[PDB]
């Protein structure tokens, strides 16, 4: 649209909504898509956006954790043996990793089990 809707805050052409309901990462993401067309879990593209998000969330949630829109942070990279041999055989542990942000300081990133229930922030582009 042209303006952020009533309960949402504006930052650089996007709208943001802190949600004080505890949900899994999946459910939180889906909830965000239902608030507004093009709504998702917050994404963060600079220290200045992180600062904005903290400034917005801290008075609402105080010191807390919010789901943010990244998952599988350790899946897509190359994995290499120190002895320089080729990775021909795999024996992975079962993981579940989703991005959590702290609501203080500079929005420190934490790994978290995706089925853990947390507060979250939604975002969409105007």
């Amino acid at each position: 649209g042209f303006c952020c809707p009533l309960r949402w805050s504006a930052y650089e052409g996007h709208c943001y909504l802190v949600v004080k309901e505890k949900k899994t990462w999946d459910d939180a993401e889906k909830f965000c898509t239902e608030q507004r067309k093009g709504g998702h879990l917050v994404s963060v593209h600079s220290r200045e956006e992180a600062d904005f998000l903290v400034h917005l969330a801290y008075p609402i949630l105080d010191l807390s954790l919010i789901w943010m829109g990244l998952s599988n942070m350790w899946n897509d990279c190359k994995r290499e043996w120190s002895d320089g041999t080729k990775l021909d055989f795999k024996s992975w542990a079962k993981t579940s990793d989703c991005l959590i942000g702290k609501t203080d300081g500079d929005n420190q990133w934490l790994n978290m089990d995706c089925s853990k229930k947390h507060y979250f922030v939604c975002k969409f582009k105007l």
Partner: protein, 130 residues
């Protein structure tokens, strides 16, 4: 087949569990400094998996133990897209939160590999030629 005292032979290589807590870089460095050289163990077959798991259990390790597997990435982490379709142009994981170095998991009898912070302190397995 002929290994140093304390080391165990499997398929032409020598193996030993070291009960010294080290970070991943320090353990790898330690392994390279063994008399015949070498590295933190790699696991390249079902046979080697089973041999190393039994070796570690025989040694009554009660926590995770390093192996030689590590994530190599350009940035702090691996995902390139947020759920909203946007690019990852900024990252903010602490070193405590980065999970680039692999252990053998105690919780599986040392058969499966889990990525954890590289600065964690664990015992480890070295592999050397005889």
């Amino acid at each position: 087949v002929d290994c140093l005292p304390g080391w165990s032979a499997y398929d032409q290589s020598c193996y030993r569990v070291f009960k010294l807590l080290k970070t991943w870089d320090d353990a790898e460095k330690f392994c390279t400094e063994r008399p015949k050289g070498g590295h933190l163990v790699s696991i390249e077959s079902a046979g080697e998996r089973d041999f190393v798991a039994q070796l570690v259990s025989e040694n009554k390790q009660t926590d995770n133990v390093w192996l030689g597997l590590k994530i190599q990435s350009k940035g702090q982490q691996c995902s390139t897209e947020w759920t909203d379709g946007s690019s990852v142009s900024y990252e903010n994981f602490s070193e405590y939160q980065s999970k680039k170095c692999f252990v053998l998991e105690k919780n599986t009898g040392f058969r499966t590999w889990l990525n954890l912070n590289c600065g964690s302190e664990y015992s480890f397995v070295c592999k050397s030629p005889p």
